[PDB]
Curated annotation (Swiss-Prot):
BP-aspect Gene Ontology terms: cell adhesion
Changes seen on gene knockout: Probably essential, it was not disrupted in a global transposon mutagenesis study.
Chain intervals for the UniProt region annotation (Disordered): 138-183, 200-236
Superkingdom field: Bacteria
Ranges annotated as biased composition (Polar residues): 155-183
UniProt feature, compositional bias: Basic and acidic residues: 140-151
Subcellular location: Cell membrane
Membrane topology according to the record: Single-pass membrane protein
Listed GO CC annotations: plasma membrane
Record keywords: Cell adhesion, Cell membrane, Membrane, Signal, Transmembrane, Transmembrane helix
Record's protein name: Mgp-operon protein 3
């Protein structure tokens, strides 16, 4: 379509011409039209073929989780509350104008819960969501028991040197390795039926109740509410020495409320989960947002009969290729304890599920394939014992960061056994670092349950709110989180985690989508789905988003780590991803081969490129296992891109003519108030980041049918921005020009930005030109002005006699472009704007001509031009020339 769709608010979409004007009566309440009540809002939209697919979700939605029986997750059907999220297909039904009409409507039902699954769900606990205002110190949690305390007890590390071997701990040098972190202080953990609080502790090493939910409601919630009360008033607001109050930051990331109380976790998880949409020839796929963990995603068969309910597939049911199989195992071993003969000791690992949650970046389609990316949300076992048990109320988690004397090559670094089955890092003193070595047997690791616990014990599953597994407030955590563990000897090289800060991506075939649908619909037991064209990557937050890290040496940890993060987040430890988008490269490839395609996604401090081999629709690889997998490239932001508030992402578009992605950030999406309940004042304006491909791409000639270097991208805060206007929309008309529609009060105003060697700058004279449209749909045309149509001066009629063209015929002149171009002189308003003349015979002696002129979008327009079938009626002139012969 020749037009741009703009979400004007939560319900309405309006169609815009390339002249930044609305098509008259295009404005449409998609919610009303989808026959959904006014609690519903548009979450996401996409065009596929010609139709508009819209994902809708409800403010009134209520979900409950009941551990007994077995249809355990369901909607709360008393009051208003049976309000599932829908996807809708609309088609334009006029040839003139835009008249959307509904075609199909698909309901997104709650997930089936298998018996096995319900035994994990029973005791599943979830961290409160990370928020703009969450602090490094808010995240910090107190260190759990050491390796020897769990295994031996009261009985120091002199017993260690010889009792190692009888707990399967042979040659392990780290009796002082953390086994995880206390769940009795810190960010709240809650089960599916409880509700998270509006308060976050400032120092979670001291100030919150963690999972101690009873604790919270009879002591500590009272200290919070008194320290950090909501804005109502007459004003009131107190002191915030202990807790932030983030209710409004919670409202703004999609947490739902009954008055001042968040709804239950499972409800929050369902609302979040229905956030992004992608479409292929057979499927609709819906996945969650990048603010909360999603535990499931929907595959909807477009063939689905009207009033079906469509079912989500659990990710715990979705095995991915993590790159090597050992990468999968790191993750699964740390999910929870095994053998677990025990009694009620059910967690994700103990029941043979895989990683259960992701922080999804987003979701797209290229050619019947689906692309996703995301962060592994942290998940680990915790001891829920209730009697001693040394680990009681502790989470079980440890660094899995590669040892120093590992062979240096992606595969070697990745498969190295360090931390595979249990703890091993912490501090080590011979030129101090956090990582070591790896006589009569190899070094060994094992899970922090002691063998006399074996079957007394109760290890249940939790999920974090970020990509960290391990919150323990020791120094290894900071270096894990910030990509600071480095080796020696070679040209250095950096040591990966396999559990913290793991990015995941892939491309999913339609047969893959088909097993997932089948997994979701499975009778009785859990059936499973393998997605084989995926990878994983250790992707830490840049360390330059902190200050004052002590190395060469009392060590810096999460509770002392100082954030200078500029990207809108208080914290400098947790990664975040947004706005995954694919596109087809316009730059053609050798004629044997199929069109290249990529995706990009934003993370903290850089853009990630995803590279594909088309024509077999796989991740890109090279053969040498040593070089890192070539389907991922990371290019760090400069200062100006890092300055953008990532929490303000509004949308991302791709343009095929230009080969460029445009990320739109709208500051109006900032919460109303701070975590100190102060009003937020920099909520005005917007920012655009433009991402392009870099590098040598696949298949340009015989040299590049294979590659040992991954293609990359580059993001550039492009010069299009504002701290003053309220954005309606950005129309990327061409590489050389973008149009911005904004208000300074109640206006809509059009501004044109022009690209000057890679930097966009506003052009005031073009803006005034484009914006003077006199209420029509396009810029006016004035004879004496170099306006948006340039300027056209016609030759006088006496040119015919001078040039001896009177001897020619009308039809002869009319069939000679070259001659017609000599009847006018054009002056362009921008550098390569083109114009020609269209002729029309008027009589035997005479013709008329009328210019056809190129606009900022690169298209030609003339008298007969339409958009969405509606004539523009731009007033191009026409001029008669006469005195031609009839030979
Ligand atoms: K003009």
């Amino acid at each position: 379509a020749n037009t741009f769709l703009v979400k004007e608010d939560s319900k309405n979409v309006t169609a815009y011409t390339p002249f930044a004007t609305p098509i008259t009566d295009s404005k449409s309440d998609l919610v009303s039209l989808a026959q959904l009540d006014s609690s519903y809002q548009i979450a996401d939209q996409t065009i596929h073929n010609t139709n508009l697919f819209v994902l809708f979700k409800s403010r009134d939605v209520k979900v409950k989780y009941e551990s007994s029986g077995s249809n355990n997750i369901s909607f709360d059907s008393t009051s208003q509350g049976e309000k599932p999220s829908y996807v809708v297909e609309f088609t334009n039904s006029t040839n003139i104008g835009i008249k959307w009409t509904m075609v199909k409507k698909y309901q997104l039902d709650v997930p089936n819960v298998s018996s096995d699954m319900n035994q994990v769900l029973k005791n599943l606990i979830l961290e409160q969501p990370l928020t703009k205002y969450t602090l490094n110190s808010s995240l910090a949690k107190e260190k759990g028991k050491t390796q020897r305390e769990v295994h031996l007890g009261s009985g120091q590390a002199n017993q260690w040197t010889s009792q190692r071997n009888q707990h399967d701990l042979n040659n392990n040098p780290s009796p002082n390795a953390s086994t995880g972190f206390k769940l009795t202080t810190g960010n709240a953990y809650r089960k599916l039926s409880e509700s998270w609080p509006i308060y976050e502790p400032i120092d979670g090493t001291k100030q919150g109740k963690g999972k101690d939910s009873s604790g919270w409601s009879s002591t500590e919630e009272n200290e919070a509410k008194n320290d950090a009360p909501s804005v109502s008033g007459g004003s009131s607001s107190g002191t915030f020495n202990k807790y932030l109050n983030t209710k409004q930051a919670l409202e703004s990331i999609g947490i739902l409320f009954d008055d001042q109380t968040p709804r239950n976790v499972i409800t929050q998880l369902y609302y979040a989960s229905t956030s992004k949409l992608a479409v292929t020839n057979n499927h609709i796929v819906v996945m969650g947002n990048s603010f909360l963990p999603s535990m499931w995603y929907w595959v909807v068969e477009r063939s689905a009969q009207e009033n079906a309910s469509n079912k989500p597939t659990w990710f715990a049911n979705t095995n991915l290729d993590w790159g090597e199989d050992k990468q999968k195992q790191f993750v699964e071993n740390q999910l929870g304890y095994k053998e677990t003969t025990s009694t009620n000791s059910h967690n994700f690992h103990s029941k043979s599920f895989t990683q259960p949650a992701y922080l999804i970046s987003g979701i797209d389609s290229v050619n019947d394939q689906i692309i996703f990316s995301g962060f592994k949300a942290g998940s680990v076992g915790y001891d829920s014992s209730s009697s001693s048990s040394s680990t009681k109320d502790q989470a079980l988690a440890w660094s899995t960061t590669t040892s120093l004397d590992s062979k240096t090559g992606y595969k070697d670094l990745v498969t190295n056994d360090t931390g595979l089955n249990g703890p091993i890092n912490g501090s080590f003193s011979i030129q101090d670092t956090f990582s070591f070595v790896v006589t009569t047997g190899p070094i060994k690791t094992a899970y922090p349950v002691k063998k006399d616990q074996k079957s007394t014990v109760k290890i249940n599953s939790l999920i974090n709110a970020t990509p960290l597994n391990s919150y323990g407030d020791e120094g290894i955590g900071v270096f894990d989180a910030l990509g600071l563990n480095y080796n020696f000897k070679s040209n250095q090289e950096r040591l990966p985690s396999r559990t913290d800060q793991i990015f995941v991506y892939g491309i999913v075939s339609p047969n893959e989508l088909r097993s997932a649908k089948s997994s979701a619909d499975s009778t009785g037991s859990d059936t499973k789905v393998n997605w084989s064209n995926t990878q994983s990557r250790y992707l830490p937050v840049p360390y330059n988003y902190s200050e004052g890290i002590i190395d060469a040496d009392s060590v810096t940890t999460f509770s002392g780590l100082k954030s200078i993060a500029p990207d809108g987040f208080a914290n400098s430890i947790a990664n975040f991803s947004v706005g995954l988008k694919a596109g087809i490269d316009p730059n053609p490839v050798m004629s044997g081969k199929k069109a290249n395609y990529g995706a990009v996604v934003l993370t903290r401090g850089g853009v990630v490129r995803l590279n594909f081999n088309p024509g077999n629709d796989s991740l890109l690889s090279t053969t040498d296992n040593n070089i890192a997998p070539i389907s991922f490239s990371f290019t760090p932001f400069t200062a100006a891109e890092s300055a953008v508030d990532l929490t303000t992402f509004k949308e991302v578009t791709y343009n095929q003519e230009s080969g460029l992605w445009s990320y739109i950030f709208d500051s109006s999406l900032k919460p109303s108030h701070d975590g100190k309940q102060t009003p937020v004042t920099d909520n005005m304006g917007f920012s655009v980041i433009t991402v392009s491909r870099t590098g040598i791409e696949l298949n340009q000639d015989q040299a590049t049918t294979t590659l040992d270097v991954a293609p990359s991208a580059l993001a550039v805060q492009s010069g299009i921005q504002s701290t003053t206007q309220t954005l309606t929309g950005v129309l990327p008309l061409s590489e050389e020009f973008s149009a911005v529609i904004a208000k300074d009060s109640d206006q809509n105003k059009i501004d044109i930005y022009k690209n000057n060697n890679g930097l966009f700058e506003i052009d005031t004279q073009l803006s005034n030109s484009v914006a003077t449209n006199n209420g029509g749909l396009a810029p006016s045309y004035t004879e004496n002005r170099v306006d948006a149509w340039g300027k056209v001066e016609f030759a006088d009629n006496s040119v015919l006699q001078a040039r001896n063209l009177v001897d020619k015929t009308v039809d002869e002149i009319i069939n000679t472009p070259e001659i017609l171009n000599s009847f006018f002189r054009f002056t362009p308003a921008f550098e390569d704007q083109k114009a020609t003349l269209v002729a029309t015979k008027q009589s035997d002696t005479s013709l008329s001509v009328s210019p056809r002129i190129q606009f900022l979008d690169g298209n030609f327009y003339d008298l007969n031009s339409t958009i969405a079938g509606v004539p523009l009626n731009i007033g191009f002139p026409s001029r008669v020339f006469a005195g031609f012969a009839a030979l």
